[PDB]
Design a protein around this ligand. Structure first.
Ligand SMILES: Nc1ncnc2c1ncn2[C@@H]1O[C@H](COP(=O)(O)OP(=O)(O)OP(=O)(O)O)[C@@H](O)[C@H]1O
Ligand SMILES: [Mg+2]
Lengths: 97, 114, 222, 321, 258
């Protein structure tokens, strides 16, 4: 959300997931990322939409995007004697998507 | 990386405490120091004078560093050279000799003592 | 160019209330005044130094409530040790419940509410204009010292330091004595001499100053 | 009458309605005559339904919420006058309620930068504006009633009182009465309160049929002509107005004798109170005694006023009830 | 009105840990919700096959070819018709309770508020899901909402029963998580007394034959081994599907397996 320099009204501006509508968004090093930033794609990964309620703007956008992500396991390397849940830090809500 | 580090100590000593308080009170009591000669001498030594090093400094400096290495890093020798060449700028000269390197090593080892 | 309150009060008193909550930005100015009394000015291309000789009267609030059987006075308040050392005198006034004192305090407070006049007593309130006239006249006066008087000050200071070497204990006292304490002893003797006396200072004046400092120091328990 | 219980808080609100007598003192000082009350308690304890009642019953009342308020919105704001062209000041919530009451809800959820301003108004009762070439002191003499919640969801009796309340001590010292209220599970209390609530929810306004939705619209007919026993609300409003404007009691010695003994007894005891006792408790006793004297429509403070004030403050601080 | 959805900490409910370590919402916000639904997966095969068939019918196009028919006949209505019915009902009716409805609601409030006291005393920790007066007002609102559907001008015991059942399904179920074991201070002696009583019961009673709760109380308590918490120990042994079965209106305790 940005203030328009000319009109001086709050307006919406695009992002990475909106620039890649009907495209592909690639996220390298997906495990070395803040949880607050990672959790922003929960709605876009399944519902394929973005909802904003800020500064008098109440809108829903559209992001029909596919995500291919690459990550590293805990310790930098995979332990084949352990289950998956103890080789990564991600939880079920993001692994199911 | 600091060339000289000094530790100022304050210990409860009767002689030192009395002597300090005495001259402090004497200063408060109402009853060989040049004023601006220092500034002009400093400017003269800094703007015209450039000393050099001779083999007399070589002979003392190398053996002094080795004797200090009988945990002195290589920074120590470049610290001695700077102090010796700064002392040479004093007692106005144009070259270093044994007195300057002796004073420099004495200063840098008295620094080590603390 | 707009000067601050510290600069504004020259040869005057700066009363800093709620000094605990005041920010480090002002702590810089408080630190510098006690050191040199000459305020350096903002960086708006003027490079100005302004005279700021002033006296400081600070009121403090201990951290999280009241006094705490935590032994260190540094733990009671946020103020750094260096900042407190520059202060000439520190006074602790702790509220200790005592059955006798509460009765007189309540009576004194309630007399003011019943009758607006303050409670009449043998103590006589001197007229305030006389207060100002005497204070100004004392301020104009200039004392002077003698060599004999300051000799006993050295003995007092060495006794204080020999006490301070063993005074380091669990609860009482704040660090150790510093030459600034000797300086403040003479500085306080100045005012007690200016109060009524003139020319050379009396020997008992040093005793009075030492007594006031010692009572303030002993206020740490009380 | 739609709140079950909370008798002591309802007495404190009434004493707020009939404020104390303000004393103007030398050195340009004034002793405040307002009574300020804080309520800390568990969720769903009818804290917010008393602030709403005070909003309606009082002559002047201003409502405030912690998170939806700012410092410039409580004291004053610099604006411009379009018609003439100068720059002027616009009043905020605190100064608009001069000789009135301010009811603040979710008081603990207020930001720190917001909470300093209310401090000054609670202490000096004046606002200082030194912005944009407008140097002014504004009068704000208002009574504060506030409601908050503890740090956790519910009050804990196994922890010290200061840990339960997130408010600082300086702010907490400026309230005359702090009421900690707790919901305790008991079958008889539940049976009575559930019966009361179910009786309340079965009320039909006159002129309405069963199942008829309430038509809170008035059909654009704004006005017809353009200009044990309980008491009705307008009569209470008349009583409060008459008491505030017609009686100014003065303190007496025999009441002071009771006040001093209560203060001395309270100060020197090992009981653990929810709030510390200090030299400002005496002023609270005096103010409560003056208010109770006004309630009686009398020009002097009697011993009974001191007894009632003592009982109220003992309940507030100790809960000895 | 507010309709909210959220996930627990760690993603899944993790029934192994305490409810207080699973819900991050404070008591202040949780008291403003009339109904709270905790949703879990049971991983049953029959349900999985039914859901799989239902979802595949949606994708293969068999969904619409069915739905219209029911929407035609008598069992479903369109979105617009239901919207118009909702607005008509909200703008026409506002029911009221009956004297018997209040009596039935007060007793239910007393019961559901008593149960919380026993639960909190047993678990020696405060409940994360609170029960307050708002929970009584919620049931009143649900009763009146149920009455609103039929355009009835009065709410009666028929609606009260369904409102009570909905509240039990929604909030009392969430409150009554019934932890099998938390290894906390509560039931600390039980950490060994459970195994002790299980061994004493399995040595007394072979794999056949039955006993009674009356006898299993009187005789095993004459030795002063009672703990007041053995009511759920029998159910926990039953959970093993072998130790205990309850028959004959709960009177008979039958040993069924190892
Ligand atoms: N003693 C009571 N008598 C009548 N109604 C009550 C009582 N206590 C609570 N209630 C009811 O509980 C509901 C919520 O009360 P209220 O909003 O005043 O609570 P609160 O203390 O402000 O809560 P919160 O901590 O959630 O802000 C209201 O419907 C109110 O009528
Ligand atoms: Mg509320």
């Amino acid at each position: 959300v940005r203030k328009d320099p000319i009109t001086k009204e709050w307006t919406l501006e695009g992002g990475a997931l909106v620039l890649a509508d009907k495209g592909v968004c690639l996220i390298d090093e997906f495990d070395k990322m803040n949880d607050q930033d990672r959790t922003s794609i929960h709605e876009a990964m399944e519902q394929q939409s973005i909802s904003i309620s800020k500064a008098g703007i109440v809108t829903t956008l559209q992001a029909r995007c596919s995500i291919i992500a690459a990550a590293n396991p805990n310790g930098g390397r995979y332990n084949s004697t352990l289950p998956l849940a103890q080789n990564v830090s991600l939880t079920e809500p993001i692994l199911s998507r | 990386r600091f060339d000289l580090v000094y530790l100022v100590l304050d210990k409860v000593d009767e002689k030192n405490d009395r002597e300090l308080a005495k001259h402090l009170t004497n200063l408060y009591l109402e009853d060989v120091l040049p004023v601006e000669f220092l500034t002009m001498y400093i400017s003269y030594a800094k703007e015209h004078i450039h000393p050099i090093i001779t083999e007399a400094a070589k002979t003392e400096l190398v053996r002094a560093y080795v004797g200090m290495r009988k945990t002195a890093t290589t920074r120590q020798l470049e610290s001695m050279i700077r102090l010796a060449e700064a002392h040479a700028k004093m007692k106005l000269k144009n070259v270093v000799e044994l007195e300057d390197v002796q004073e420099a090593v004495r200063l840098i080892r008295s620094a080590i003592k603390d | 160019l707009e000067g601050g309150a510290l600069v504004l009060a020259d040869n005057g008193i700066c009363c800093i209330d709620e000094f605990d909550k005041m920010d480090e930005s002002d702590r810089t100015a408080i630190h510098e005044v006690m050191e040199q009394q000459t305020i350096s000015i903002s960086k708006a291309g003027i490079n100005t130094t302004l005279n700021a000789r002033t006296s400081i009267l600070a009121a403090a609030n201990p951290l999280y409530g009241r006094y705490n059987p935590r032994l260190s006075p540094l733990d009671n308040i946020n103020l750094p040790a260096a900042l407190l050392s520059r202060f000439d005198i520190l006074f602790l006034m702790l509220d200790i419940p005592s059955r006798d004192d509460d009765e007189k305090l309540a009576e004194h407070v309630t007399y003011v509410h019943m009758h607006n006049k303050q409670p009449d007593l043998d103590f006589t309130p001197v007229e305030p204009s006389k207060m100002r006239e005497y204070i100004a006249y004392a301020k104009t006066k200039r004392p002077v010292m003698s060599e004999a008087v300051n000799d006993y000050v050295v003995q007092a200071y060495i006794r204080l330091r020999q006490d301070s070497k063993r005074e380091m204990d669990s609860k009482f006292s704040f660090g150790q004595a510093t030459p600034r304490t000797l300086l403040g002893i003479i500085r306080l003797s100045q005012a007690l001499a200016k109060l009524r006396l003139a020319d050379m200072v009396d020997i008992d004046d040093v005793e009075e100053a030492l007594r006031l400092v010692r009572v303030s120091k002993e206020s740490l328990y009380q | 009458p739609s709140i079950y219980g909370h008798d002591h808080i309802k007495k404190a609100i009434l004493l707020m309605l009939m404020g104390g007598v303000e004393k103007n003192l030398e050195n340009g000082s004034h002793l405040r005559g307002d009574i300020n009350i804080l309520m800390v308690g568990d969720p769903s304890t009818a804290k917010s339904q008393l602030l709403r009642f005070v909003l309606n019953t009082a002559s002047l009342a201003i409502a405030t919420t912690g998170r939806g308020s700012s410092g410039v919105g409580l004291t004053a704001a610099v604006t411009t006058d379009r018609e003439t062209g100068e720059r002027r000041l616009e009043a905020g919530a605190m100064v608009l309620a001069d000789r009135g009451v301010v009811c603040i809800d979710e008081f603990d959820k207020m930001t720190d930068v917001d909470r300093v301003a209310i401090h000054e108004v609670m202490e000096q009762q004046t606002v200082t504006i030194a912005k944009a070439g407008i140097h002014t002191t504004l009068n704000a003499r208002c009574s504060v009633i506030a409601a908050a919640n503890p740090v956790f969801g519910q009050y804990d009796v196994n922890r010290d009182p200061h840990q339960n309340i997130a408010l600082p001590d300086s702010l907490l010292s400026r309230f005359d009465l702090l009421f900690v209220v707790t919901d305790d599970i008991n079958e008889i209390r539940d049976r009575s309160i559930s019966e009361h609530v179910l009786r309340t929810h079965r009320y039909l306004p006159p002129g309405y049929l069963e199942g008829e939705p309430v038509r809170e619209r008035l059909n654009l007919s704004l006005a017809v002509g353009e200009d044990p026993k309980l008491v009705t609300i307008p009569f209470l409003r008349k009583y409060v107005q008459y008491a505030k404007e017609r009686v100014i009691p003065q303190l007496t010695q025999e009441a002071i004798n009771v006040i001093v003994k209560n203060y001395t007894d309270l100060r020197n005891d090992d009981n653990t109170k929810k709030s510390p006792i200090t030299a400002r408790t005496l002023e609270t006793l005096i103010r409560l005694a003056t208010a109770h004297a006004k309630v009686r429509l009398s020009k002097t403070v009697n011993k009974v006023d001191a007894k009632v004030a003592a009982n109220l403050l003992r309940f507030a601080l100790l809960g000895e009830d | 009105s507010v309709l909210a959805a959220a996930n627990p900490i760690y993603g899944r409910y993790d029934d192994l840990k305490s409810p207080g370590d699973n819900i991050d919402f404070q008591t202040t916000i949780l008291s403003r919700f009339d109904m709270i639904f905790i949703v879990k997966d049971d991983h049953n095969e029959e349900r999985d096959i039914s859901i799989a068939n239902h979802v595949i019918n949606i994708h293969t196009g068999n969904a619409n070819a069915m739905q219209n028919q029911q929407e035609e006949n008598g069992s479903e209505i369109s979105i617009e018709k239901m919207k118009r019915y909702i607005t008509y009902c909200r703008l026409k009716c506002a029911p009221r309770l009956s004297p018997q409805a209040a009596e039935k609601l007060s007793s239910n409030f007393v019961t559901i508020r008593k149960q919380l006291l026993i639960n909190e005393l047993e678990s020696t920790e405060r409940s994360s899901i609170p029960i307050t007066i708002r929970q009584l007002e919620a049931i009143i609102r649900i009763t009146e909402s149920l009455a609103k559907l039929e355009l009835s001008p009065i709410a009666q015991e028929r609606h009260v029963d369904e409102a009570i059942r909905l509240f039990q399904a929604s909030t009392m179920d969430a409150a009554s998580q019934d932890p099998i074991g938390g290894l906390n201070q509560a039931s600390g002696t039980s950490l060994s007394e459970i195994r002790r009583f299980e061994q004493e019961l399995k040595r007394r009673l072979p794999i056949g034959w039955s006993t009674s709760y009356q006898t299993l109380r009187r005789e095993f308590v004459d030795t002063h081994r009672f703990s007041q918490l053995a009511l759920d120990k029998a159910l926990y042994a039953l959970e093993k599907h072998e130790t205990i079965q309850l028959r004959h209106q709960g009177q008979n305790i039958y040993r069924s397996g190892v």
